[PDB]
Structure 1
Amino acid sequence: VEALSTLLRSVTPLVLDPTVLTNAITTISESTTQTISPISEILRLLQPMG
């Protein structure tokens, strides 16, 4: 499977940019007085091994 995966990644016009998702998310306004911010949590969920 690794062989085919590398071959696929070798020739592909598609590009994966993680920044686009974070930008779309972080820019959402929220009150700073709440004890839990969903934005931080969802970032913490998909950030690992980024």
Structure 2
Amino acid sequence: VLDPTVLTNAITTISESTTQTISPISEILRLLQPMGNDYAAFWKCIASW
């Protein structure tokens, strides 16, 4: 059961300064977390093999 509060909960507790303009936590949290189909691509890849 791939639950994405395990990846998110590890990145969200790295400490970064808020005074920086470009924030390297908010970029990757924008990168993966909008979610389409609860990450079912992985099943398709596995199914295809």
Q: Same fold by TM (over 0.5)?
A: yes
Higher relative contact order (CA 8 A, sep 6+): 1
Deviation of 1:48 (Å): 2.1
Return the TM-score normalized by structure 1. Answer: 0.65
RMSD over aligned CA atoms reads: 1.1
One of 11, 15, 20 as aligned partner of 1:34: 20
What 5-or-longer segments of structure 1 have no aligned partner? 1-14
Task: Return structure 1 stretches of 4+ with deviation > 6 angstroms.
Answer: none
What 5-or-longer segments of structure 2 have no aligned partner? 39-49
Distance (whole Å) between structure 2 residues aligned to residue 23 and residue 33 of structure 1: 22
Give the aligned length: 36
In structure 2, the partner of 1:5 is none
Distance (whole Å) between structure 2 residues aligned to residue 21 and residue 44 of structure 1: 13
In structure 2, the partner of 1:44 is 30
Return the TM-score normalized by structure 2. Answer: 0.66
Max radius of gyration: which structure? 1
